[PDB]
Design a protein around this ligand. Structure first.
Ligand SMILES: Nc1ccc(S(N)(=O)=O)cc1
Ligand SMILES: Nc1ccc(S(N)(=O)=O)cc1
Lengths: 1721, 263
């Protein structure tokens, strides 16, 4: 931002000639060159050079002296060539960026091979295998045909390594699948540019470690600025990542290579190699013919004459390869030459008489179907161009390599894509028609180099002969290019606006200073410094501006003002800032020039017909040089008055010709003008992505008609047909004659669906085509649709769309996915109320798919909406479902809130109790207005209470009032407090411990999830804090647990969460507490706390609160007033929308909370750091800097050095913290405490911590409202409950007069938030989707004994009340008592049916139900019945520990395990030697993540903080899954797997594999100590106890504290003597009772819970006594027990005979290894 | 006299393309819709036309060839003298500048059974003081064939293209006009027996208060003006709940696409 700038004229700086610009003024030819003269043309001959004799005496390096990993890439070679030998050390033994300049064909791509081999070597295990998923290599090649040849040869040289090499293709979604399996991507510059422009989520660009840039002299072409963009973006991104990327450039030998090397960051001393043109494999004797005739007729005569004479000097002696520059010209000149040979009786020199080649030619000509090839092949002449068959071209190539064709005329394609050298090459004219330039122009330098490179066959000739024929006034140019003297310049200025916009859209450039920095990496910059005169800079200008700071600022300023004039960028001229826009993003991502999107933005309207659509397209700036030539005007006219879309403009306008050319391309018309055909190819090559940009523009604006016409036109462009044609044409395998027979039959396509093969063949009048057409008809994509309409309010409607595929899949036709758009359109089909992408995967082609979305609705209701599902690629492939509202039942309008009454603020003295008042009187003097209004009811009555009010209303004090009241009534009274989140429960536990244990000396406990721990906790404590599931496991057994009945008070917090993802367990336990209260004739008081609810009255009725005790406050009554602002951002690409939020975040801080604390919620871990850094960046370039730090820099240095994240130290220094799941809890505490104290003013938090954050703020900003789910690979909306929790953080009652929140959201969400944050919230039950495990538990406990009981059960729920109030939501159609009865009956029926099929229950007389074994196991261990079913279906009488790990890791309890991190692939590759292995691997599946983290646990492998918390959650359920397996095995009598699962319980407890040292349990033992103890032979924990104390001290080699930890474990280790007696042993009697009484005695009484540090939960010792027999593997009896000092236990069995049997007895731990006992009897 | 010195060659200049460019711009007229209000008495019914289906009807029309929709609706809950138009049904049709050509079969669908037929609406190239004798004959013959068309309840709405806009006037038949239109076979401009007392204006208002909807044919589209052969006064057709494509949409003129492709 240096103000005295100036606006440049980019067009006047441009090198107009492109690759034809000649910067050098003088031209010097090799010694021995000479000119000859002839009439109207001069000749220059340049002799072949001699090879430079070896000066460095460097012998060729034998493949054997390479590093051995690299030798397989050189299989079948003896030694590298001279170039590769001089390059070997740099390529293979360093990572140094390189630039190799050598004449085309000297070995450069074998040098690139060596570089790729170095990269491959970096990833070679000890197994010899390669970590093929650990990296990517990009090979950038200028021409597509070259790309394909490189894919073939690189894949073939690297096959022996297991490396995939592949071409990057056009499809955007399904191809990235393969791109994940490709280690080497070969693509053009423009494709890598488009790929790294989109950026985004799930990018493999992070893996790229090596980029090869082949033919880097393209820098000089008009395409060159792509390479500049790529390299600048790559080097800046290396800096933004600190992850290196090797750059290799391969160049011809041309001047300025020292500057190219500067631009690649090549050290000249180490990475620059220049081989002059004497290193050409075959020496080149060059001939340049420059024609002076300016008359076109005479000039082309002269050209054919020079060609003929030159050919005659090689006829019979050498093959001649003539490059011409159109497709028709190959045949035209082959025929010219052949005719002049026959007119001069010379055709006999090419083929000798009687040659076998003459006959091979006659034969292949007669077999060939190319008429030109037929006419020419007998004479030894051939043609070769892209318009020929692959078999025809392969014929020509093989017959030319075979020395049969003696004259081959060809296009550039053959020179780039095929390998075929000829002794003689003739370039016939250097003129080419460029549609982009709209005119004739000189050939590109790359094309010339390549073509002349094809002269001289490498091992068959001793010299090539290149003959270039051109205009006389071009001789110097071509003489420079082929003799090392045409300097490489930068063409960047011509592309500066577009290129710059890409860096703005990517976030890499946010202002003009960034842009100046970015331009500092351009090759343009290096040339401007080295040669200012060429680039419009005077030498005085440079000496005054030595770094070209001002010049770059002026260029960036010019480009920015252009982009700003075209509405792609918002450019603040004062600050220099750049604001991205949606049009800018679409321009970058569809590779469209910035003028074109300005035109689109200016002309597109919702009312556009096809007519204006085609015109708008025809006006694109890609086509600005197209002209209507006089000689086209007749053919154009013939088409203009026949095209099916009318054209308003005269054919004198370029726009009318472009329009007609599109319409003819779609109708597949063959044109006649050559100008017309080449223009049509150019115009349609880009129509698809331009039209796909229109599509995205008009779809995201909601324009329904134009979205239809535009997607349609994309598909007609891609399929080359109109809508009006038989969609059967889209199966290429279907013969066209048949489809045209049918199109003539004219009947509607759809009726073919209702006929079988026979009636098909009848209607067609072709009978065999009957069955073939039937098959294709049912391969055509087709979806069936249905809706469940679910009213949310009277103006918001949830829709569940069910998509049922109705076609046969066939990977030949459909691939592996098929894509669709779901469009929800209003009454008039004018507005897209909602849209989304939908991908049908081959995996799921037969499954129904469910889509849910919200649409607005109004009163009077509109008649209908429409749901369209239309194929993204198939024409005529669509289904529309009318959604009528004639029977929509809306919920009643919601009531007025409870009046907030203006009471005098309630003093703490109201509690009339000094001990009670000591809780609050330090904090504040008065309760707030909500606490003050509900106090009398909470404190002075026992009425059930509902309090609804925003988060931050102080509702937890309202719960405290009821607890205090209870404490006065019952000195040992019990209150259970349920909150739905564990982090909430832990905060409440600390605060209520302090208030009620430390102060009031009651007992406060937090339930843990361990049932016996929790039963003792529930017994002794007066305040029991729990999450729902922990209370569910407990209170299911209420009939037998007096402490669950003798509950005085039941408080449930955040009860609005019944309507959210985990709401059913919360609804069930609340319904249960109501039902127990009605049973026990001594009611349990209930207090429900909620956010503001529109249907609060329904919750209160369900929980039995009267109207006078239902406080229904709405958001306007928050005691700290809330100012909420909702900013919509109209950007549909997530990464770009977050970028556009970046400065608004900073601006919101300075507007709404410039001095007071700020919390910024962001959607992911990565974004926290990025946004902290960006807030600091914006602060620095602002006038207020470091304004967020309030502690002095030196006060928090002790704080800082305690953290490991160094970026967190840096940003904390400048006043900005951040929080995410990946920080160690101490780091979180450090940051949270620096925030609470005021040291730092801003904290950037991850969304996923919004429930366990222990700090508050003046201002909360929510930066976007979506997050990426890696399991379903898509963005998910924040649950509204999370948003209300976030907004609730902007609330500080003791410090602020107000709270402020800004929600930044995608624009299509603004209305929804305004509806559901300003008004109270409607909540529904989703219990009808989660009934099975609760029904199962109730059948276990006999609360449900029949189906009638199951209906009566449902009447206690919130589900049942909401079915009356909102029937359409629960798929009811009326609220009558019999409707409700029928619906409940069917729900019950479906659920008991599922239970009974799963063998969890029984159904006798289709009426009575009863628990089965499996159902009791599911209920006891609180395990999903589907998990237990799967356990029964997977476990066998022979299953092992690997089987057990597989089985339990596939349980339903692990499907919701968090997914993202990709080191899972790394642990999976370490699973080559992970102890237990099974079969296939997936990387996305949560079950595989749990299996991996389990094997990581038994092998003590340290993981990410994130993966660590994941392992902890897995271990939170593993023990009960293992016990369920144990019960499943013992019920099936299988002994071996049961004991293996008891061992697996031991293993997961102590983190230990099957056979390790038991000494691995002892604290502070490493591998060496186990070796030492085994060496002395102790091997046992009891042996460590037996050692003499000093002897073991001398053995351990251990600290004193460490020896004491060993001792604490050895004292708590189980030391149990058992004694068993068989009662009545004397009388063995078959079939009768065998009572075995076993006693257990503990040498030293238990001194606490289990010692198992590596296990998260605190356990208690558990034992099983087994009596199974080993020979038969029959598990006979078993009894589970907890053991204190001493205990007795009974085992029941029924004898098999009076045969004096033999049994083994097992005493098995669930927690320790080594202490298991075996006896016999 | 130049047979040989001056030679020129005819180049096609087809008319449907000029009419297609013209019909692309019909949407401009929907922001300038006017209703005649010369009828004064309110003794007849009041007909309320929702603007949404009016505007769509205008947008799908042609400037020369007439199009027609069937009107269905009901009286508001407490006001039997008001007829709300709730649905416009588009049936396979073709037309000229003076008339429309419909099938003999009236709309038949489950969704219409709770509504009553209110007559029809049609576009017209020019505003006229009187109801056409083609229109009187069309309405009268429909009534003679379909007794559900009460002559005192069914109307003809005419939608005339006035410069920059659209004028709507509503009529009904009188008994005399019914009995004349029934027997009328000369459908020139002035047939024998035609009279101004054969029709009368009925009051008609445009509303934004509720929305109408469309029904269209289930298998074909409605426009047969490029296929007039395949249209037969006895053609039978079903209906679906969906919005009609516009006059020159590709599905109405598939031959223009296939025949250009053949060239
Ligand atoms: N964002 C980004 C990622 C990777 C690359 S790459 N393939 O050039 O190193 C460039 C930009
Ligand atoms: N023009 C526009 C583009 C995108 C969006 S949004 N809110 O879907 O991303 C809104 C308007």
């Amino acid at each position: 931002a240096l103000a005295p700038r100036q606006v440049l004229d980019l067009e006047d700086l441009v090198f107009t000639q492109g690759s034809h610009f000649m910067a050098n003024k003088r031209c010097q030819l090799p010694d021995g060159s000479f000119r000859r003269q002839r009439k109207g043309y001069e000749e220059v001959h340049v002799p072949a050079l001699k090879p430079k004799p070896f000066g460095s005496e460097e012998q060729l390096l034998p493949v054997e002296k390479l590093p051995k990993y690299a030798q397989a890439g050189f299989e079948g070679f003896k030694t590298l060539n001279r170039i590769q030998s001089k390059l070997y050390r740099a390529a293979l033994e360093t990572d140094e960026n390189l630039l190799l300049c050598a004449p085309t064909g000297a070995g450069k791509t074998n040098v690139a091979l060596m570089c790729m081999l170095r990269e491959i070597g970096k990833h070679i295990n000890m197994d010899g295998t390669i970590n093929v998923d650990d990296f990517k290599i990009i090979y950038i090649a200028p021409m597509r045909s070259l790309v394909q040849e490189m894919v073939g040869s690189f894949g073939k040289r690297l096959a022996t390594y297991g490396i995939t090499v592949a071409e990057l293709t056009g499809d955007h979604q399904l191809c990235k699948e393969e791109i994940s399996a490709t280690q080497i991507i070969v693509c053009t510059p423009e494709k890598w540019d488009i790929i790294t422009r989109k950026g985004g989520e799930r990018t493999y660009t992070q893996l790229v470690r090596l980029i090869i840039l082949d033919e880097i002299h393209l820098l000089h072409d008009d395409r060159g600025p792509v390479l500049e963009a790529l390299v600048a973006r790559a080097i800046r991104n290396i800096e933004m990542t600190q992850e290196d990327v090797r750059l290799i450039g391969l160049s011809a030998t041309l001047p300025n290579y020292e500057d190219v090397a500067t631009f690649l960051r090549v050290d000249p001393a180490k990475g620059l190699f220049y081989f002059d043109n004497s290193f050409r494999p075959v020496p080149l004797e060059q001939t340049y013919v420059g024609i002076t005739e300016k008359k076109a007729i005479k000039r082309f005569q002269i050209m054919n004459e020079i060609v003929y004479e030159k050919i005659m000097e090689h006829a019979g002696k050498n093959q001649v390869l003539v490059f011409v520059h159109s497709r028709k010209e190959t045949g035209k000149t082959a025929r010219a030459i052949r005719d002049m040979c026959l007119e001069k009786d010379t055709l006999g020199l090419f083929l000798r008489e009687g040659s076998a080649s003459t006959e091979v030619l006659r034969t292949e000509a007669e077999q060939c179907k190319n008429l030109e090839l037929k006419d020419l092949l007998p004479y030894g002449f051939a043609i070769h161009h892209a318009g020929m068959t692959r078999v025809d071209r392969t014929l020509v190539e093989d017959l030319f390599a075979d020395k049969h064709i003696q004259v081959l005329v060809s296009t550039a394609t053959l020179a780039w894509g095929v390998n075929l050298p000829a002794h003689t090459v003739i370039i016939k004219g250097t003129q080419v028609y460029s549609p982009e330039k709209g005119r004739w122009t000189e050939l590109g330098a790359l094309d010339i180099l390549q073509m002349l490179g094809r002269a001289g066959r490498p091992q068959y000739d001793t010299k090539g002969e290149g003959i270039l024929i051109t205009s006389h006034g071009e001789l110097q140019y071509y003489l420079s290019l082929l003799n090392q003297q045409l300097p490489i310049e930068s063409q960047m200025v011509s592309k500066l606006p577009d290129m710059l916009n890409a860096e703005i859209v990517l976030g890499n450039v946010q202002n003009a200073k960034d842009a100046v920095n970015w331009l500092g990496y351009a090759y343009l910059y290096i040339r401007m410094l080295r040669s200012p005169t060429l680039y419009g800079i005077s030498h005085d200008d440079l000496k005054g501006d030595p770094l070209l700071d001002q010049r770059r600022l002026d260029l960036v300023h010019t480009a920015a003002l252009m982009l700003d004039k075209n509405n792609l960028v918002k450019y603040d001229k004062k600050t220099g800032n750049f604001q991205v826009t949606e049009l800018g993003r679409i321009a970058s991502h569809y590779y469209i020039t910035n003028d074109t999107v300005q035109t689109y933005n200016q002309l597109l309207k919702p009312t556009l017909s096809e007519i204006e659509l085609f015109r708008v397209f025809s006006l694109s700036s890609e086509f600005k040089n197209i002209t209507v030539r006089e000689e086209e005007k007749l053919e154009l006219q013939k088409l203009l008055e026949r095209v099916p879309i009318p054209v308003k403009e005269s054919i004198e306008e370029p726009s009318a010709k472009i329009n007609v050319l599109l319409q003819a391309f779609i109708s597949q018309l063959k044109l006649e003008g050559f100008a017309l055909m080449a223009d049509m190819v150019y115009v349609t090559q880009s129509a698809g992505r331009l039209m796909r940009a229109i599509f995205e523009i008009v779809l995201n604006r909601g324009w329904a008609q134009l979205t239809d016409k535009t997607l349609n036109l994309c598909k007609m462009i891609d399929k080359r047909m109109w809508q009006s044609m038989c969609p059967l044409r889209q199966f290429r395998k279907l013969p066209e004659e048949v489809v045209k027979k049918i199109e003539k039959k004219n009947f509607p396509f759809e009726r073919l669906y209702d006929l079988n093969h026979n009636e098909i063949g009848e209607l067609i009048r072709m009978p065999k085509m009957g069955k073939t057409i039937h098959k294709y008809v049912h391969l055509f994509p087709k979806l069936e649709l249905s809706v469940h309409l679910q009213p949310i309010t009277r103006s918001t409607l949830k829709v569940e769309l069910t998509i049922t595929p109705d076609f046969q899949w066939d990977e030949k036709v459909h691939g592996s996915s098929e894509a669709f758009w779901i469009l929800v359109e209003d009454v008039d089909s004018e507005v897209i109320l909602h849209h989304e992408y939908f991908l049908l995967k081959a995996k799921y082609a037969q499954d129904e798919h469910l889509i849910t979305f919200f649409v607005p609705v109004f009163e009077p209701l509109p008649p209908q909406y429409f749901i369209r599902v239309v194929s993204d690629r198939w024409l005529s492939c669509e289904t529309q479902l009318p959604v009528s509202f004639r029977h929509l039942i809306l919920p009643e309008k919601y009531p007025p809130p409870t009046e907030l009454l203006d009471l005098q603020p309630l003093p703490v003295s109201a509690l009339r109790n000094s001990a009670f008042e000591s809780l609050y009187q330090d904090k504040f003097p008065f309760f707030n207005p909500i606490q003050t209004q509900v106090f009398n009811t909470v404190y002075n009555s026992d009425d059930n209470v509902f309090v609804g009010a925003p988060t931050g209303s102080g509702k937890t004090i309202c719960a405290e009032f009821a607890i205090l009241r209870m404490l006065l009534q019952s000195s040992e009274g019990r209150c259970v407090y349920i909150t739905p989140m564990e982090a909430l429960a832990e905060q409440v536990y600390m605060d209520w411990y302090e208030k009620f244990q430390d102060r009031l000396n009651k007992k406060v406990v937090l339930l843990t999830g361990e049932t016996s721990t929790d039963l003792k906790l529930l017994g002794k404590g007066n305040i029991i804090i729990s999450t729902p599931e922990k209370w569910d496991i407990l209170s299911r057994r209420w009939k037998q647990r007096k402490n669950v009945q003798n509950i005085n008070l039941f408080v449930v917090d955040e009860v609005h969460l019944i309507g959210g993802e985990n709401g059913p367990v919360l609804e069930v336990i609340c319904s249960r507490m109501r039902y127990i209260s009605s049973q026990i004739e001594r009611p349990i008081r209930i207090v429900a706390l909620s956010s503001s609810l529109s249907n609060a009255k329904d919750v209160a009725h369900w929980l039995g609160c009267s109207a006078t005790s239902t406080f229904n406050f709405h958001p306007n009554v928050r005691p700290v007033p809330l100012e909420l602002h909702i900013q919509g951002f109209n950007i549909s690409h997530t990464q770009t929308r977050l970028l556009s939020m970046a400065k608004p975040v900073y601006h919101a801080i300075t507007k709404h909370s410039p001095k007071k604390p700020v919390i910024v919620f962001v959607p992911s871990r990565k974004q926290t750091r990025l946004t902290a850094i960006d807030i600091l960046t914006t602060c620095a370039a602002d006038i207020q800097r470091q304004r967020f730090l309030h502690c002095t820099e030196k006060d928090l240095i002790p704080y800082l050095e305690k953290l490991s994240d160094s970026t967190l130290k840096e940003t904390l220094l400048n006043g900005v913290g951040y929080l995410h799941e990946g920080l160690s809890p101490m780091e979180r505490r450090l940051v949270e405490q620096l925030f609470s104290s005021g040291a730092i003013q801003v904290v950037v938090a991850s969304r996923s911590l919004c429930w366990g954050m222990n700090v508050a703020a003046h201002l909360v900003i929510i930066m976007d409202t979506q997050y990426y789910n890696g399991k379903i690979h898509a963005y998910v909306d924040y649950p509204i409950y999370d948003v209300l929790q976030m907004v609730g953080h902007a609330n500080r009652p003791l410090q602020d007069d107000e709270g402020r929140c800004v929600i930044m959201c995608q624009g299509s969400k603004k209305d929804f938030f305004k509806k559901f944050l300003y008004e109270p919230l409607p909540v529904e039950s989703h219990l009808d989707h989660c009934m099975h495990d609760h029904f199962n538990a109730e059948i276990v406990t006999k609360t449900i004994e029949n189906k009638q009981d199951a209906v009566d059960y449902l009447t206690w729920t919130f589900l049942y009340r909401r079915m009356t109030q909102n029937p359409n939501y629960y798929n009811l159609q009326g609220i009558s008592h019999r409707h409700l009865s029928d619906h409940l009956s069917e729900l019950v029926e479906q659920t008991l049916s599922d239970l009974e099929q799963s063998k969890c229950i029984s159904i006798e007389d289709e009426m009575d139900v009863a628990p089965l074994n499996l159902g009791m196991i599911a209920a006891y261990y609180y395990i999903n019945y589907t998990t237990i079913e799967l356990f029964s279906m997977s476990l066998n009488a022979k299953t092992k520990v690997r089987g057990l790990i597989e089985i339990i890791s596939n349980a339903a309890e692990y499907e919701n395990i968090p997914i993202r991190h990709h080191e899972d692939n790394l642990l999976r590759q370490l699973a080559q030697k992970v102890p237990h292995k099974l079969n296939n691997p997936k990387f996305n599946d949560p079950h595989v993540k749990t299996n991996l983290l389990l094997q990581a646990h038994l092998s003590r492998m340290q993981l990410s903080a994130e993966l660590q918390s994941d392992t902890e959650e897995i271990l939170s359920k593993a023990i009960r899954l293992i016990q369920a397996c144990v019960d499943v095995l013992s019920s099936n009598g299988w002994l071996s797997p049961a004991l293996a699962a008891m061992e697996l319980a031991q293993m997961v407890t102590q983190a230990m594999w099957s056979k390790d040292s038991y000494l691995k349990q002892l604290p502070h033992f490493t591998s060496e100590h186990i070796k030492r103890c085994t060496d002395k032979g102790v091997e046992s924990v009891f042996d460590i106890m037996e050692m003499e104390d000093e002897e073991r001290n001398a053995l351990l080699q251990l600290t004193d504290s460490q020896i004491a930890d060993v001792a604490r474990f050895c004292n708590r280790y189980p030391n149990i003597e058992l004694s068993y007696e068989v009662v009545d042993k004397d009388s063995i009697r078959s079939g009768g009772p065998v009572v075995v009484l076993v006693q257990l005695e503990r040498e030293e009484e238990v001194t606490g819970p289990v010692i198992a540090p590596l296990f998260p939960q605190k356990r208690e010792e558990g034992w099983w006594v087994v009596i199974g027999d080993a020979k038969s593997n029959s598990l006979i009896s078993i009894k589970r027990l907890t053991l204190q000092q001493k205990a007795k236990v009974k085992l029941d069995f029924v004898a098999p005979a009076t045969g004096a049997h033999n049994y083994t007895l097992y005493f098995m731990s669930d927690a320790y290894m080594g202490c298991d006992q075996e006896y016999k009897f | 006299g130049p047979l040989g010195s001056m030679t020129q060659t005819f180049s096609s200049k087809t008319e449907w393309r000029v009419r297609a460019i013209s019909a692309a711009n019909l949407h401009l007229r929907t922001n300038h819709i006017y209703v005649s209000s010369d009828d004064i008495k309110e003794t007849g019914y009041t007909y309320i036309l929702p603007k949404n289906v009016l505007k769509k009807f205008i947008c799908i029309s042609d400037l020369r060839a007439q199009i027609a929709g069937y009107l269905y609706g009901v009286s508001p809950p407490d006001n039997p003298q008001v007829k709300e138009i709730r649905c416009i049904v588009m049936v396979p049709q073709w037309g000229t500048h003076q008339t429309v050509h419909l099938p003999g079969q009236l709309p038949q669908h489950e969704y219409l059974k709770e509504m009553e037929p209110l007559g029809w609406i049609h576009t017209q190239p020019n505003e006229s003081p009187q109801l056409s004798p083609q229109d009187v004959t069309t309405h009268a013959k429909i009534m003679a064939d379909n007794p559900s068309w009460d002559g005192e309840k069914t109307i003809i709405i005419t939608c005339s293209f006035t410069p920059g806009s659209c004028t709507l006037t509503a009529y009904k038949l009188t008994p005399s006009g019914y009995e004349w239109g029934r027997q009328n076979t000369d459908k020139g401009n002035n047939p024998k027996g035609y009279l101004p007392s054969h029709y009368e204006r009925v009051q008609m208002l445009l509303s934004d208060r509720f929305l109408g909807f469309f029904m269209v044919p289930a298998q074909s589209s409605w426009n047969y003006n490029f296929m007039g052969v395949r249209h037969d006064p006895n053609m039978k057709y079903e209906l679906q709940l969906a919005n009609p494509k516009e006059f020159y949409h590709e599905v109405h003129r598939p031959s223009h696409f296939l025949n250009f492709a053949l060239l």
